[PDB]
Each structure stands twice: as structure tokens, then as C-alpha cells.
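can u do me a favor
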């Protein structure tokens, strides 16, 4: 069934606790969602200076997430948001380049082999692996298309020597926006993104160079020099679902808008995005459940929040997600 849900960030940062909240799973299940992605920072169990370190005790926390996934009917997709030699997160600068460095790739495979072995008994109904979050545009001085595909193929091969049936999720290139043409591997799904356009979704975002973005507006939002509307969004995701002609399913592993964009603009944009995803049968995950991109505790100035067990619920946003 089409995946619909959220990312949970309790293992996202080097400062994260690793302690996920069971009530998140309870609530999203009661709202009829069925998917969570877990973007993980490998430094929570490893070392900046030695990428082969694994502190296995950390994964007792992920074991709990898998239990709650099974208890509440929520598929768990575990992802490396930071891995040896790569992350889009600037909180730590990687000293090596995963896409070129043999040692970082060995460590990458070492981590994924450890994780594959730990969860070999867990069905892909309940658990998938997203090997690496948001590879860059394939500039071959950093990462060629062939660099990426050969590494992903090698890593999948090693994972499936351990667990032959494990479902793998593969992010598009260009930070999850470009389909990967020559990765037609059995039992995989490719993952796109729903942040187009940045003037709406990343207005005043501190971790992006956003100082010159125009006032958010939708339609006619702005994204790296180009103006977007729902027909342009439709065209974009039509190129994605072309992967289905090669036997490859697609879904949108992250989407949403930050909390400095006027709510009326966010809801107009999100309505169009979700209508396109329903049209094309594309699953989705909002970047936050609780948090600035989320339906809860998003700290928007212009929302009449609903009380939700000590939290603040954006009911309009939730009901949009629930209807698509």
C-alpha cells in the first residue's frame, strides 16, 4: 500500500538523544498514517576520526522503533542521513568523500552490514533501508553518476548476502530530485523530494543560503532562479513515475515547508503537491511530525493551534495530509 507518513528526527543530529516517542506512532496510526522514515546520524554510534567504530548499544533504541512500527502498523524506513564521508547536514564537516574514497566506502558497507545482520529476521513489510540521504548533483569531481551507482550496487550486494529479501530505498541524485536511470535493481524503490519551490518551503531557513529569496507566494513560487506552478510540479513528478516502466516504484521520502512561510501560502502549495501525489499514486513523508516542518509543535505565528496532549496541532495541515 502507498506509504503516507513522516520523518522522525530523534537520531538525526550529533546532539540527538536517540529516544523516539511511542506516542508519535500511536497518534499517526490513529490518524491512519502507515510510514515513518528515520534519518540517522552515524556519529551517534561511531567516530569522526574513525568511521569503523560501532557502539552497538545505540541500536537498542532503534529496536524500540521497530517494535512500535509493528505494534502500530507503521512501516519503518531506516536511513543514513550522515554516513562516513557524506551528509547534507553541515553541523559536522566530513573529512572524507564517500563517493570517491575507498576507505569511507568500506566503512559505509561495514555499517550497513552491521545493520542488515541485526535486523535479518525483520520482514520488508515492516522494515526498509535507505542507504544514504540526498546525494548531490553528479559533478564527477565530487560524485559521478557511475561513482554513485557502483557504490549503491556494491552496498546492496553486501546487504543481500546477509538478508536476500531486504527492500532498499534509493534517493534520487541532485538532493533527491533526479531519478537514477541505470539503477534497476530488484526490490528497490527510488525516493524523490517535495521541497520545490524553495521560496515557499525554505523561506528564511538558516541552513540554506536563503537571504535573497522572494516573498513566498503560490502559485508562481521561486526555486533556484525558476518560477513554479502546479503544472510544472505535475510535469516534474511525471518524469519520476516513468521509472515504473522499468519496474521501479517511487515515493517522496521528504516534503514540506518551514515555519516562517505564511500559513495560507503553505496550505495552497501543499494542497497542490498532495493532489499531484494522489493523482500519480506517489507516497509521501512530511519532513517532521513534531517540529518546524511538522503538523505538531511547528511554532508558526499565524496558526490557531489545537491542544494535543501537551502539544500544539496544526489541524488544517493534518486534515490536508489525511485526505490525500
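np, heres the sequence
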Amino acid at each position: 500500500p502507498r506509504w503516507r507518513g513522516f520523518n522522525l528526527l530523534e537520531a538525526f543530529s550529533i546532539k540527538s538523544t536517540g529516544n523516539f516517542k511511542e506516542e508519535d506512532f500511536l497518534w499517526m496510526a490513529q490518524w491512519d498514517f502507515n510510514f515513518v522514515r528515520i534519518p540517522m546520524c552515524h556519529l551517534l554510534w561511531s567516530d569522526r576520526g574513525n568511521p569503523f567504530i560501532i557502539r552497538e548499544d545505540f541500536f537498542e533504541k532503534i529496536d524500540r522503533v521497530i517494535f512500535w512500527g509493528e505494534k502500530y502498523g507503521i512501516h519503518i524506513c531506516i536511513s543514513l542521513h550522515r554516513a562516513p564521508g557524506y551528509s547534507v547536514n553541515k553541523e559536522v564537516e566530513e573529512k572524507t568523500n564517500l563517493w570517491k574514497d575507498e576507505t569511507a566506502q568500506e566503512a559505509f558497507i561495514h555499517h550497513w552490514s552491521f545493520i542488515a545482520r541485526r535486523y535479518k529476521g525483520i520482514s520488508s513489510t515492516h522494515l526498509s533501508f535507505n542507504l544514504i540521504n540526498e546525494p548531490p548533483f553528479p559533478d564527477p569531481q565530487i560524485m559521478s553518476v557511475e561513482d554513485h551507482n557502483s557504490l549503491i550496487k556494491r552496498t546492496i550486494t553486501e546487504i543481500r548476502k546477509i538478508d536476500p529479501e531486504r527492500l532498499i530505498i534509493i534517493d534520487g541524485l541532485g538532493y533527491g530530485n533526479i531519478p537514477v536511470d541505470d539503477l534497476t535493481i530488484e526490490n528497490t524503490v527510488q525516493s524523490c523530494r517535495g521541497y520545490i519551490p524553495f521560496s515557499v518551503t525554505h523561506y528564511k531557513a538558516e541552513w540554506v543560503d536563503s537571504k535573497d529569496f522572494p516573498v513566498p507566494e503560490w502559485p508562481n513560487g521561486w526555486h533556484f532562479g525558476e518560477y513554479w506552478n502546479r503544472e510544472k510540479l505535475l510535469e516534474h513528478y511525471l518524469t519520476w513515475i516513468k521509472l515504473r516502466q522499468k519496474g521501479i516504484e517511487v515515493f517522496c521520502g521528504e516534503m514540506g515547508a518551514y515555519n516562517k512561510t505564511p500559513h495560507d501560502v503553505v496550505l495552497k502549495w501543499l494542497e497542490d503537491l498532495l493532489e499531484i501525489f494522489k493523482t500519480l499514486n506517489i507516497g509521501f513523508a512530511l519532513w517532521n511530525f513534531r517540529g518546524p516542518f511538522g503538523i505538531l509543535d511547528s511554532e508558526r505565528k499565524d496558526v490557531e493551534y489545537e491542544e494535543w496532549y501537551g502539544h500544539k496541532l496544526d489541524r488544517k495541515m493534518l486534515e490536508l495530509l489525511r485526505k490525500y
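The first helix runs from residue 22 to 30. hope that helps!!
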